[PDB]
Every structure is written in C-alpha cells, then in structure tokens.
Short mmCIF file of C-alpha atoms in Angstrom, two decimals:
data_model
loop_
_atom_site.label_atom_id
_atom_site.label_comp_id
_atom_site.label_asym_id
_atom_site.label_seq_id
_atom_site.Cartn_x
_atom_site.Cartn_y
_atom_site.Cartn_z
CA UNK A 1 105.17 82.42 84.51
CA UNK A 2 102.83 85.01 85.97
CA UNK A 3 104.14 89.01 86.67
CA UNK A 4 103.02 92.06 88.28
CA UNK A 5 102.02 95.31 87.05
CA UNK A 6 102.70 98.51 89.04
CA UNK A 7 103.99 100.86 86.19
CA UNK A 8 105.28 103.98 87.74
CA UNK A 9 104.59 105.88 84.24
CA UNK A 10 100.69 104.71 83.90
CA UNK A 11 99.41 105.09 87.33
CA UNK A 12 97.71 101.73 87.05
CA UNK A 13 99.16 99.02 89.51
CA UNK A 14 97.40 95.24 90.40
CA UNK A 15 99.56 93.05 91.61
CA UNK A 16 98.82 92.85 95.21
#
C-alpha cells in the first residue's frame, strides 16, 4: 500500500 507525500505545511512534495 504505497502513498504520496505533498505536505502543504513542510514544503517538501514527491509523489509525482
């Protein structure tokens, strides 16, 4: 069960 990460708090997002 994979996710993405695009936190709009920790301007880190990889997902696409």
């Amino acid at each position: 069960v994979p996710i993405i990460y695009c936190n709009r708090r920790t301007x880190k997002c990889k997902r696409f």
